[PDB]
Amino acid sequence: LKKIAESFEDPSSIVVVLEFILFALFFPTEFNRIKGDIQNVLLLFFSRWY
């Protein structure tokens, strides 16, 4: 997955999170192979808000 590096701070930065939820419902085959690093960029999201 082409690294999209950003830090979640503003409540408006939900667009980066919603981008994967939308991608996962179109290409399950492709998502099932790169779910790995798409996870750790989203694991950074869970450290900040929760």
Next chain:
Amino acid sequence: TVTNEFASRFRTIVATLANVVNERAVQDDMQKATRSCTKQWLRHLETQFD
């Protein structure tokens, strides 16, 4: 370490120091836009330290 420790200690400083700032915008009871614009600055200041 996954997430740097030295910077995570700084987050505790901002977390409780910002709480003290609110107690002044209740006595001078500024319009939320004023109290928000200072709480927003501490987000940028802290994320730079990372």
